[PDB]
């Protein structure tokens, strides 16, 4: 008895039917095969459980054995779970560059990743070059960007310019990108976005031994602790190279530093589900970190 499933990438909707004992890995492989993605190590499948919680699909476990929200077809989102240390030397395929571009641009536009107004304009500039191609005074007449969402709401609200005025600045940059290929435009966007403080960071609310509210940041290079009201600059950093090991006991999270002097660091997460999520991102990120070196 086949099981109907739907998988959506940033710009595509895929329809599959799997058997009862299909594993996440088998579903995953069918997805990347369909869109011709070979740079698969960054991606994963997101689903919603019966309790309405977003979760990443375990690839080693059967799809049917993971409490995916009951429905026909089952619904999954194909998304990048991990980010490259540098897009330039890691994303070679157009499909991959496109998926990261679209996912990152969505997060920037939704104010997910903080972005200075000036940078938002430059970023929008590459997105327009990617979408419209070379600026052509004959076809791209004033107002040609009126129907495009190009800047995050936060930017629009801090600077009271009219849409026309924003478009004017965006257009001036657009004109300067003539000759830039669609794929190259997307990569330029990413090269800029990847230098943003909040780019590629998974934040989790935690508390330290003093009960102070903080954020745990997990990214490609290790872990960071942020003060509750500042997610841009780490309060303290824990690069992989300074980490002996990492473990969690239910809600307790401990970071044993390689160093002799430096003592251990304990942090508390609200739910065990959170700690499991953190450990998983820590494992995956570190793994990719080491592949960039030895494997």
């Amino acid at each position: 008895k086949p099981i109907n499933v739907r998988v959506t990438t940033m710009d595509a909707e895929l329809e599959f039917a799997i058997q009862p004992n299909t594993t996440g890995k088998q579903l995953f492989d069918q997805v990347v095969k369909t869109v011709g993605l070979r740079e698969v190590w960054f991606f994963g499948l997101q689903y919603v459980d019966s309790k309405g919680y977003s979760t990443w699909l375990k690839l080693n476990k059967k799809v049917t054995q993971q409490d995916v929200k009951k429905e026909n077809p089952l619904q999954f989102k194909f998304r990048a779970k991990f980010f490259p240390e540098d897009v330039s030397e890691e994303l070679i395929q157009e499909i991959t560059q496109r998926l990261f571009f679209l996912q990152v641009k969505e997060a920037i536009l939704n104010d997910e990743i903080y972005c200075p107004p000036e940078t938002a304009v430059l970023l929008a500039s590459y997105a327009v070059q990617a979408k419209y191609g070379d600026y052509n005074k004959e076809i791209h007449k004033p107002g040609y960007l009126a129907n495009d969402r190009l800047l995050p709401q936060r930017v629009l609200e801090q600077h009271k310019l009219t849409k026309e005025q924003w478009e004017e600045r965006i257009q001036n940059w657009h004109e300067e990108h003539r000759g830039m290929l669609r794929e190259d435009s997307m990569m330029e966007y990413l090269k800029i976005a990847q230098d943003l403080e909040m780019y590629g960071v998974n934040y989790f609310e935690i508390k330290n031994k003093k009960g102070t509210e903080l954020w745990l940041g997990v990214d490609a290079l290790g872990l960071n602790i942020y003060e509750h009201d500042d997610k841009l600059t780490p309060k303290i950093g824990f690069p992989w190279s300074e980490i002996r090991n990492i473990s969690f006991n239910d809600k307790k999270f401990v970071i044993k530093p390689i160093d002799k002097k430096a003592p251990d660091f304990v942090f508390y997460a609200p739910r065990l589900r959170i700690n499991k999520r953190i450990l998983a991102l820590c494992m995956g990120n570190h793994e990719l970190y080491m592949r960039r070196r030895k494997p």
Partner: peptide
């Protein structure tokens, strides 16, 4: 639950 993850050493 209890889970450990070796990073270095």
């Amino acid at each position: 639950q209890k889970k450990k993850l070796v990073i270095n050493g």
